[PDB]
Each structure stands twice: as C-alpha cells, then as structure tokens.
Amino acid sequence: CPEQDKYRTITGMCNNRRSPTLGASNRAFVRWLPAEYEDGFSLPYGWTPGVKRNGFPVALARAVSNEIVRFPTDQLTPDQERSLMFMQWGQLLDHDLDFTPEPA
Amino acid sequence: CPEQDKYRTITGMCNNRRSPTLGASNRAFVRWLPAEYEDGFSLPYGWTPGVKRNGFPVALARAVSNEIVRFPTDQLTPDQERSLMFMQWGQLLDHDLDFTPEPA
Amino acid sequence: VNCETSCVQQPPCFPLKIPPNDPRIKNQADCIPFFRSCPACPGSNITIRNQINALTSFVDASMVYGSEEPLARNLRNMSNQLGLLAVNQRFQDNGRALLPFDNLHDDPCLLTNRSARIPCFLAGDTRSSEMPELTSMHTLLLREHNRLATELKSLNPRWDGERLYQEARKIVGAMVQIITYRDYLPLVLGPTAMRKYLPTYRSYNDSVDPRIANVFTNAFRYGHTLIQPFMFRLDNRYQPMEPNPRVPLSRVFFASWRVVLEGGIDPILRGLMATPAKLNRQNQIAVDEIRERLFEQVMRIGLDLPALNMQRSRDHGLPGYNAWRRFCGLPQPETVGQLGTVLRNLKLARKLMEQYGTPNNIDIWMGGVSEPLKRKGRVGPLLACIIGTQFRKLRDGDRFWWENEGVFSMQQRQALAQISLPRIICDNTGITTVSKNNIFMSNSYPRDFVNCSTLPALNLASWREA
Amino acid sequence: VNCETSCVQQPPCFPLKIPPNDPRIKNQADCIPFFRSCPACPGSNITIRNQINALTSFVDASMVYGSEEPLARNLRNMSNQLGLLAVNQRFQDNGRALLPFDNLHDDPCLLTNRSARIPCFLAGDTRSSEMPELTSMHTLLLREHNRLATELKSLNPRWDGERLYQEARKIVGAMVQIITYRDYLPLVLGPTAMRKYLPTYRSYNDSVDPRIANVFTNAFRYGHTLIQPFMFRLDNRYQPMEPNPRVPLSRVFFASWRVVLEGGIDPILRGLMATPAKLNRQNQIAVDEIRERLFEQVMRIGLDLPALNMQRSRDHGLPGYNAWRRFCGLPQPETVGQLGTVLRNLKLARKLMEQYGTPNNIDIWMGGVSEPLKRKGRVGPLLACIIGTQFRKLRDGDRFWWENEGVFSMQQRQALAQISLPRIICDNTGITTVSKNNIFMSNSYPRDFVNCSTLPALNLASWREA
Numbered sequence A, B: 001c002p003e004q005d006k007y008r009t010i011t012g013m014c015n016n017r018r019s020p021t022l023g024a025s026n027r028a029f030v031r032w033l034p035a036e037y038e039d040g041f042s043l044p045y046g047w048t049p050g051v052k053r054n055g056f057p058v059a060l061a062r063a064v065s066n067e068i069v070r071f072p073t074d075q076l077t078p079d080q081e082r083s084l085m086f087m088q089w090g091q092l093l094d095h096d097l098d099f100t101p102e103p104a
Numbered sequence C, D: 001v002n003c004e005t006s007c008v009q010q011p012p013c014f015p016l017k018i019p020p021n022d023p024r025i026k027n028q029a030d031c032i033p034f035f036r037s038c039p040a041c042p043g044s045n046i047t048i049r050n051q052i053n054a055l056t057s058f059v060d061a062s063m064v065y066g067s068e069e070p071l072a073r074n075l076r077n078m079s080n081q082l083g084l085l086a087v088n089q090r091f092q093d094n095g096r097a098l099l100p101f102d103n104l105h106d107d108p109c110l111l112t113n114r115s116a117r118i119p120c121f122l123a124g125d126t127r128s129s130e131m132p133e134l135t136s137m138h139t140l141l142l143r144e145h146n147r148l149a150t151e152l153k154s155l156n157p158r159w160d161g162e163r164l165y166q167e168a169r170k171i172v173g174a175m176v177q178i179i180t181y182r183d184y185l186p187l188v189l190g191p192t193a194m195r196k197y198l199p200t201y202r203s204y205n206d207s208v209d210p211r212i213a214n215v216f217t218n219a220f221r222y223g224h225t226l227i228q229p230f231m232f233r234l235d236n237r238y239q240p241m242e243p244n245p246r247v248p249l250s251r252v253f254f255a256s257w258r259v260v261l262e263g264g265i266d267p268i269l270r271g272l273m274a275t276p277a278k279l280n281r282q283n284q285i286a287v288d289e290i291r292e293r294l295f296e297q298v299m300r301i302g303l304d305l306p307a308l309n310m311q312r313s314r315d316h317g318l319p320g321y322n323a324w325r326r327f328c329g330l331p332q333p334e335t336v337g338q339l340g341t342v343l344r345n346l347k348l349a350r351k352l353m354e355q356y357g358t359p360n361n362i363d364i365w366m367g368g369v370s371e372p373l374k375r376k377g378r379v380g381p382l383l384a385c386i387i388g389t390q391f392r393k394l395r396d397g398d399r400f401w402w403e404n405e406g407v408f409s410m411q412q413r414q415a416l417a418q419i420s421l422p423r424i425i426c427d428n429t430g431i432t433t434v435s436k437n438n439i440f441m442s443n444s445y446p447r448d449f450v451n452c453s454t455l456p457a458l459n460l461a462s463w464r465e466a
C-alpha cells in the first residue's frame, strides 16, 4: 500500500494498511458465529429430506411466510413518525455495503 | 450426528452437534485476528526483497535466531522446579492438538 | 442448470418447496426459484462454505462510484477534464441529468414495458433499477457529484479531471456518512441503543475489522417490513400526480421506463418525502406486493421476499435466533412461555413454536423482525445489537471516516456538518418546498415542509486551494 | 521444486536466507529448507490463505488412536476380540510391548544408524519417533490401553472387541485430560493466570468454539525453550546407565533403533523424571542442538528450529507482537524504552528493536518467549493469555470433557480423579521407584521419589456393568 494516499482506492484495498483486503471488494464475508450446515460444511438446512435441525424438522421458508408474515393489505398501519424516505435511504445504504453474488 | 453416542468419533466430527466439523480433523484453523501477508492474502512477509512490513524491513529469521536466541550451552540454567517430563508431556500434548500438513 | 426455469434441486439451485394449501401456488411440485450464493472457495471439501461480498464494506458511496476499477472508469465522463460522471445521452429529466443505460444481454427492464423499450440504468451498483425510488436516489447523487465537480472547477481552475473527480467523490462519500450516522441510524436504533453501540467517535482504530459480517446481509433486510405496497408520486403542490399517482410495486420493479417516460424523478422524491413508511407490527410484518408478487413481471412466477430471506440464511449457514441473542448477550428463550415474554406477544410465540419447534431454529430475519421495537427505534433488541455493532465497526475501522483527523480540514468539516439531504434535493431537482429536517421523520405536507431558501447551502470556500 | 535440496524460492518452498557472517553456514547462497504449510483453499485468489489442522483439536489421546478412520483401524489388533492396539511383532522391551513399525517410503529413522536397520514406529500421530523420549511416552500409553482392555475383559466377559477398545480408549483420553489440566497447565501458567483463564469448570457450553486457533500452533512452541541438549538414561539405581548415559539430541532425532537395541523405554523414562528441564531465561532461549543441529543426521544440513518457528508464523500470516498484546488486553509498547519496561530488560529490548524496527513487527514466538515468566509459571503474560484462552475453549467446548455430566458416572469420575502419570509408569514398565506427584515438578532422586506401591491404583470396579 503507498505510505501516503489521499483518496480511497475504488476497491477499498489498502484502507486498513496492516491487512489490506479488509473491507475491500470480492472477498469472503467475516463470520461472527461458526456456520451451521446440514453436513457441517456446505449443504443448507432443508436440502435432504428427513434431516432434522437440532431435533426438529426444518420448517419450509414459504410455510413460515404464509403463516406469520401474511396480513390483509388494507389493514396496513402507516408510521406517523417516519417518511418513506426512511425506507428508501435504508436500501440505498444497504447497496453501499453488500451484494452477495449468485451464479448467472 | 447420531442422537445418542457414548464414544467420541475418531475424527472429532459430531462433538459439537450444531456445527459438527468444529474440532474435527483436516479442517482449517480458526483465526483470532485477520492474517497479515505481504500482498494482503497469500504471500508471506519476507517473500519479495525490498517489501517492508509496516514501514520497516523484514528481519531474516536466521539473523534474529543468531543475534537473540543463540547462547553458550555451558551456561544452561537447570530448572530446579521442573523435571524434563514437563517438557516431554508438552510435546506429547501438542501432538494431540495440532499437526499442520506440508507438501511432500 | 437454470434455476429460474426448473424446480430440480441440483447445484447451484436450492428451490423453495411449496407447502400444502398455499394461498397461491396450488401445485406442490412447483417451487419459488433460488440460486445459492457463490462460494468463496468453490469445490473444497475442507473449508466450511462462506459467501462473497462484491462491494466495499465502507460507507463510501460505492453504489455511485463502483467497487471495481473497470466499472468505476466506465462510469466517468472521459471526454473532457471536468471530473464528471457520465449521464444519459438520449434522455434528460426536464433538462436535468439521468443515469446512462447499461448494456445487459438479458435485460429485465425491457420486459416491464415491451413497447417502451427503455433498458436498465447503469450505476456503481447493479441494483439501481430495482424500484424507481431507488433510481431517483441514485440519480440525485450523480447530479450532486456533477454539481460539486462544477463548483470545484470554478474555485480551482487548475485542477484536472482526476482531482475534480476524487475531490467531489470525497465530499459525496462524506455526505452519505453524515446522513447515515447523524440522521438515519438514530431513528433506526432509537436513543438507548444508539448510546450503547455508537458512542461518540474518538479516533480511527486499525485493529477494528470493518468487513460486513455474513449475518448483517440478512439482518439488515429488516427494511423489507417498511415497504409500502405502492409507488407514490406527487406534483409541485404535493397533490397526487395524474394519472398513475399510486402504482402497485409489482408494476414498478425494474421499470426504468417510468423514470424516463412518466415525469422524471421529482414526483417520486416528493412521494418519498410526504408519504409515511409502513410501520412494522407483529401481526403486519410485510405486504403481499413483496410476499406474493415480487418481480412478477420479469420472472416466471412472483417471488416471496420474506421466504427468500429465510431460505438465504439457510443457504449462508447462519445460526438461528437463540444463537444470535446469546452472541448479543440477550436472554435466550427456550420455551413458548419464555418466547412470549421476550416478544410481549404470546400468540406470536405459539405460532413461531408451531412452525419451528424450538427457538434455536427460528431463522434470524424472522426472529429479528418479530421483536417489539425499541422506544423511538424501528428494530428490536437483537437487530439493534447486530446493526449497531456493524455500523460501529464500519465507522471506527474506516481510515477515511470524515471526522478522522487528516481526511478533511477543520474548516471543511465545519462546512460538511451543514449538509442535509433536503438541501441536496433543493440543489438537484425542480422541487422548491422540501421536508424540514429530520427528513426521515418529517412526512406531513405542508406542516413539516419548508421552502428550499431557508436551508443552508454547502459552502465550498474551504476547498479553494490557495 | 524439491525444497529439501534447492534454495530457489518457487512455490511451495519458502527457504530461510542466510545472513553475512552466519556462525555456521558460510555460503550465503545456501539456505535452510522450508516448505510452506498446505493452504485450506488451493489456488483461491478470493480467500485469505489459511492452514489445516490434520488432528482433532480435542484432548482425546488422538496421538495414540489416530484422527482418521483408516489409520485408527490399522493401529488395532484385529486378530482377536480383545480390543487391543497392535504391537511390534519382532521386538519386545524386556517382554513388554513396543510400537509397530511403519512402512515409509523414505524412512528417516533408517538413516540414523544404517547397520541397525530399525524403521520408524507407527502410532496415531506421525511424529512418534521424532525423539526417543516422545516414543517412550507413546509406548507407555499404548501399554496402558492394552492393560485396561485386559482388566476390562475380566470384569465384563461379555464385551466384544469394539466395546473393549472404546471403553479403554475413553479411559486413556480422560487420563490425558486430567494429567493436562490438573497437573501440567497449573505449572505452565502459574497461579494467577490459571484462575483468570481457567476458572472452575461449570458445564459443557456448545457455543464455545473448540478449534485450535492458528496462533496457538506457534505460541505453544514456547516448549522449545525447555529442551535440554541431551537424552539422559538412568538405570534402576537412577545412576547413569553405561554406555551412552547422555547422548546429544542431534544423534537421537528419529533414532528408533536406540529404543529397540539400547535398552527399551525404562532408562529413558527414568532420565525424564530425574533430570530437570532447561529454564527459559531472556539470555538463554534455546540450545544449539535444535538451533544448529536439528535433524542433522537425516537432512542435507542441520535446521534451526527457532528460526523455523519465525518463518512459520510469517508463512501462516500471523500478526506481530503488539497486535497479540492488544488482543489479550495488554499494553502495547511503541518505543524501545516502553519495550524495555514491558520486558523488564532494556538490553533485550534494544536487540529486538535493532532486528525488528518496531515492537509491532516482532514475530509472536520471539516476543512471547522473550517476556519475563509469570510467578510460579513458565510463560509470560502474552503466552499465558494465548495458551490459557486456547485450553479454556478445548475444555468448555468439548461434549466429552470427563467432568461433563453423563460422560462418566459419578463413581467412575471419583475413581478417575485418583490417576497420575507416576502410577501409569508403575503399571507398565519395570520401574519400581517413581517421582512423587506433581511429576512435572519432582526431579531429584532420591528426594522426590517414592515406591510404586504407595501410589493409588485406578479402581475399575465401577466399570463392571451389571
């Protein structure tokens, strides 16, 4: 990394000079807790039929959404203290911090 | 991981049921601090001649050994409160915990 | 394997299976398409699979500038030495700039209105056209970079294109950091979590790891509970703009053509300022426009964003709810009674236990958005812990944080402390009555609105190089 | 790319370069051989290089049993259902068992005495024949496994070979845990660090990560400072056994032939109990037998183990001294004066600064073994924090820790609490007078020796399954 610099690199490399890829792009995420996979290292819970998670069957993500998330749209409560701009800055900000690629 | 097990597996897998490869053999070490490499991700400090580690030249390990570790054998101080068994159990115990493989 | 056209579960696909008696997908052999996130170490049987972050973790406006060198060069207007970012060469918004178009081989924007033929926009981040309100924000900041590079050229006639670009970029990156930590995060976390996780800045600490933690990519999705089912557009008098003043979100995803042919960005910014956000309630978590019709116009079937969030956490191998409450030092509920006390809602607790069996298995986004909201905040204790911890690291571990000694002069910092997103709107659009600050709270016209002339402008005098 | 014979720095080699006026290697074109540790994700430019631990991190006697299933089965005696570990079929140590020989392509042990032709031993870990004292400890534990399977066959005649093997293996793993945390670690850490990092066990915590941290592979090498330059052998009168009562370590590395033709393991175990370890002093860090003559008999040149330790930390990308002091909550010295105070030795501090330039760059093994030792401990505060944190994790995070409820019955734990390595030597060798516990402190014959008959024997009564 140059000993002196005045602007950020595009990639974020060299912002931390002791470990230059920290925060730079196209690098693996940091893990705050060890990962939990059905086989211990790559398969996601819910991949193999009959494999339980901590003694209980894996709940279908669509079944949980149907049961708990769903609500009659005309009953929506407007937030008297926050504008939609509060929702929109959140997405714009999220796009400054992370984008997890998928295969095309 | 079998719901009831009276003995450890040979490999160590399934000891932690939530993340079953933790502590298991032939797995990567956990890092308590981000790594520090000359290029940020693979090359060791001291790989490229002239590249400094945080503003200072890298010392040669054999030079540091020569200048600081080296001592006249005839001045050895016997540890009057520890037997050689203290050293040997340490090596045996280290061999129950880690072996870092190298290419042949 | 095209995960979008089939339900075969084979790498890289991990399709969501359909429950019995689904309210919309009656064929239990169908599925909601899903591609697993790319692995950081493909094919290894030694490494525990982890995913990749394609962006810089820093709060540096990388969504405006790009996080890869070829892309960042291509976003620049390289035909002169003015340090400008390229704007659209075929369309303008009432004389103001618009984002350039991208050249995607399979473009989803084209599919939302086949006769309009308006492609997806090109910005520092690939999701700019996902919803026109997001495009409006991306456009606003492009205009602000160009407004700033023009003023700086006037003050400093000898600066070349690279210096003008870098200097305006540095002020835009600081502006995003100030609006985020000064106006946004206090309203997200509420006052006691703000004090606990984001105590006053003291200095840059190089031992603070600034990487985005895997769990944050899922936990910050708490924002999906704030989405209203319509895209609102108001006229200069903040009245509904005719026709089409309220369009269902399932008709605006990737609809770049509405920015271009339906009024530009001013009616959209006005709609974002004078409409309330949806409040997240325990019995009203997320609307059907995102739960049933997400990307309905460009996918073979409408996706379910809440369900994709939970399936993504399993794809990423994230620990469940209790493991994250323990990480944050919060009580871990083991029984439905204990979960009802944590949640202050026993019915919600029984429903969660019916689906998951144990609290140890509740997916992080689902448990996180179910907690009661901290006072004057919009997240509960678990999400406040994870979002608070993450923004603390991005600020203390950033060598270029705007208040870090040496990034800006004392005089420049004093000038930056006067910026507000209401002012950036006054300066780059034709809107002259804007929300009173805090813009994230203000939402009632004319009550919470002020004329642009009452707002202080950013004084660039301290940037003149004597 | 044969790193052993070449000095070209091409992957996978990372040879150690020679300084001008080196005391031993006069040709600066020469080098000390070095192979970089295998990466966990070969070829990835996306991941930050990390290394592999080929063993189970748990203190489970994996060096006796193996950490992979082919090897584990091969170490067993499959000619009967007694649950025994296979023994050498060609030699015996005064009628007692010796380890089986391995079948290596290029066997280093065969090189230490070509006329004797004794190959390396085979055990659960590949380094068993590295020095004959280590082999003696491996042999002792193999004999203890067989002694226990035998006694268990009598108590429970219905148990088949698998059960017998598994139950004796379970007892040997608990014996290694008890000798390690009850007797060894207190003498390593000293009383206040023991209290601080290893408070009284409460219960298994599945949220505690039991993996060996990369730094611990380097930090636990602090034991190289305890090595004496000879292998001492004593007879039954604890008198120098003639001939060769003291043989230089450079003539004992991989010398399995000394175990077989020079008397067995008893002279060697006696030498270990009645000889003091070397005291690590800031001006007497490690002897030349390992700094100049490591593996001299079998390599083209003798290696330097201190230097290999430093090179290995760079290979593994470990942070320097101050980053680890900061991790442990210890003040980080920025100047030679401040380093002089932390080390309580300004001359050493100045030598470090001359080599390294800043305390931030001192390699962790060099900084760690340079700190003054804790009171009644043999490691300073940085090493104490690293070793202590590591061992708390291996205990709290192991579901099979011997005190964990349900691992052993209350009766078996009470029986187990009486074991001691003095007793195990008594039950498996011809030694009748052994050190008084703590065996790691006892070192003077006859003052610290007792007769084997005064030691409590392990009472297996509670293993009689009725």
Ligand SMILES: *[C@@H]1O[C@H](CO[C@@H]2O[C@@H](C)[C@@H](O)[C@@H](O)[C@@H]2O)[C@@H](O[C@@H]2O[C@H](CO)[C@@H](O[C@@H]3O[C@H](CO[C@H]4O[C@H](CO)[C@@H](O)[C@H](O)[C@@H]4O)[C@@H](O)[C@H](O[C@H]4O[C@H](CO)[C@@H](O)[C@H](O)[C@@H]4O)[C@@H]3O)[C@H](O)[C@H]2NC(C)=O)[C@H](O)[C@H]1NC(C)=O
Pocket (backbone or CB within 6 Å): A032, A033, C196, C323, C326, C327, C328, C329, C330, C385, C389, D205, D206, D207, D208, D392, D393, D396
């Ligand atoms: C079971 O063991 C768990 C692991 O415990 C650790 O290791 C074992 C061997 C012991 O040594 C133990 O002492 C260790 O803590 C244990 O769970 C742990 O519990 C602590 C305390 O609740 C958790 O700490 C909390 O962390 C959050 C999140 O921040 C952390 O993570 C970020 C990113 O890595 C770091 O940058 C931070 O520095 C933290 O490390 C903090 O916000 C929180 O601090 C705030 O709240 C506390 C109260 O909790 C306040 O007092 C503070 O002032 C702060 O305002 C804590 O630091 C730890 O994360 C958690 N670890 C895991 C892996 O879950 C568990 O409790 C054990 N249970 C029992 C019954 O033994």
Ligand SMILES: *[C@@H]1O[C@H](CO[C@@H]2O[C@@H](C)[C@@H](O)[C@@H](O)[C@@H]2O)[C@@H](O[C@@H]2O[C@H](CO)[C@@H](O[C@@H]3O[C@H](CO[C@H]4O[C@H](CO)[C@@H](O)[C@H](O)[C@@H]4O)[C@@H](O)[C@H](O[C@H]4O[C@H](CO)[C@@H](O)[C@H](O)[C@@H]4O)[C@@H]3O)[C@H](O)[C@H]2NC(C)=O)[C@H](O)[C@H]1NC(C)=O
Pocket (backbone or CB within 6 Å): B032, B033, C205, C206, C207, C208, C392, C393, C396, D196, D323, D326, D327, D328, D329, D330, D385, D389
């Ligand atoms: C610069 O930032 C550094 C990182 O700080 C963290 O993140 C920032 C954003 C803040 O939130 C800050 O509050 C966070 O800590 C910071 O360095 C950190 O400093 C702390 C405090 O000294 C260090 O904690 C010590 O850790 C050791 C090692 O154990 C830890 O790691 C293991 C394995 O991961 C875990 O199992 C443990 O649970 C710990 O998490 C502990 O042994 C030690 O605790 C013992 O001693 C203390 C008192 O010394 C006792 O109270 C305890 O009870 C124990 O007996 C500390 O917890 C932390 O390791 C270190 N992190 C890094 C990356 O170096 C630094 O201080 C900041 N500098 C300045 C000037 O601000």
Ligand code: HEM
Pocket (backbone or CB within 6 Å): A087, A088, A089, A090, A091, A094, A098, A099, A100, A101, C130, C131, C134, C216, C217, C218, C220, C221, C222, C223, C224, C226, C227, C253, C305, C308, C309, C312
């Ligand atoms: C205009 C409103 C928003 C969307 C439309 C939208 C959509 C998505 C989709 C499709 C994903 C991917 C789902 C999957 O895993 O397959 C997604 C991920 C993320 N979101 Fe969404 N989002 C809209 C709005 C928001 C708001 C207001 C957010 C935060 C306040 C927010 C966050 C996120 C985050 C952090 C992600 C993960 C991104 C990554 O790739 O790492 N979104 N969103």
Ligand code: HEM
Pocket (backbone or CB within 6 Å): B087, B088, B089, B090, B091, B094, B098, B099, B100, B101, D130, D131, D134, D216, D217, D218, D220, D221, D222, D223, D224, D226, D227, D253, D305, D308, D309, D312
């Ligand atoms: C008979 C005494 C000992 C040796 C002979 C010996 C030799 C080594 C060698 C060659 C290495 C590897 C060097 C390299 O990195 O290239 C090594 C590493 C380790 N040791 Fe050593 N050691 C002897 C004695 C001890 C004692 C008393 C130890 C601790 C109490 C000790 C520890 C270790 C450890 C933990 C390693 C790293 C092992 C790994 O591969 O992960 N050793 N030793």
Ligand SMILES: *[C@@H]1O[C@H](CO)[C@@H](O)[C@H](O)[C@H]1NC(C)=O
Pocket (backbone or CB within 6 Å): C077, C078, C079, C080, C082, C084, C085, C086, C087, C088, C089
């Ligand atoms: C570059 O700048 C000039 C003057 O501002 C403008 O006319 C031109 O359209 C810009 N080009 C692009 C590609 O944006």
Ligand SMILES: *[C@@H]1O[C@H](CO)[C@@H](O)[C@H](O)[C@H]1NC(C)=O
Pocket (backbone or CB within 6 Å): C113, C115, C116, C117, C257, C261
């Ligand atoms: C498509 O765009 C045109 C302009 O090209 C607009 O009039 C038309 O109404 C749009 N189509 C739909 C279905 O709204």
Ligand SMILES: *[C@@H]1O[C@H](CO)[C@@H](O)[C@H](O)[C@H]1NC(C)=O
Pocket (backbone or CB within 6 Å): D077, D079, D080, D082, D084, D085, D086, D087, D088, D089
């Ligand atoms: C197996 O056991 C018998 C005694 O039970 C012994 O004679 C034989 O040598 C053993 N075989 C091996 C390979 O150790």
Ligand SMILES: *[C@@H]1O[C@H](CO)[C@@H](O)[C@H](O)[C@H]1NC(C)=O
Pocket (backbone or CB within 6 Å): D113, D115, D116, D257, D261
């Ligand atoms: C080699 O072993 C023989 C016995 O086979 C022994 O007499 C001889 O002295 C050994 N060689 C050395 C150098 O000690």
Ligand SMILES: [Ca+2]
Pocket (backbone or CB within 6 Å): B096, B097, D055, D056, D057, D058, D059, D060, D061, D062, D063
């Ligand atoms: Ca082990």
Ligand SMILES: [Ca+2]
Pocket (backbone or CB within 6 Å): A096, A097, C055, C056, C057, C058, C059, C060, C061, C062, C063
């Ligand atoms: Ca960024």
Ligand SMILES: [Cl-]
Pocket (backbone or CB within 6 Å): A030, A031, A032, A033, C213, C214, C215, C216
């Ligand atoms: Cl994580």
Ligand SMILES: [Cl-]
Pocket (backbone or CB within 6 Å): B030, B031, B032, B033, D213, D214, D215, D216
């Ligand atoms: Cl580490």
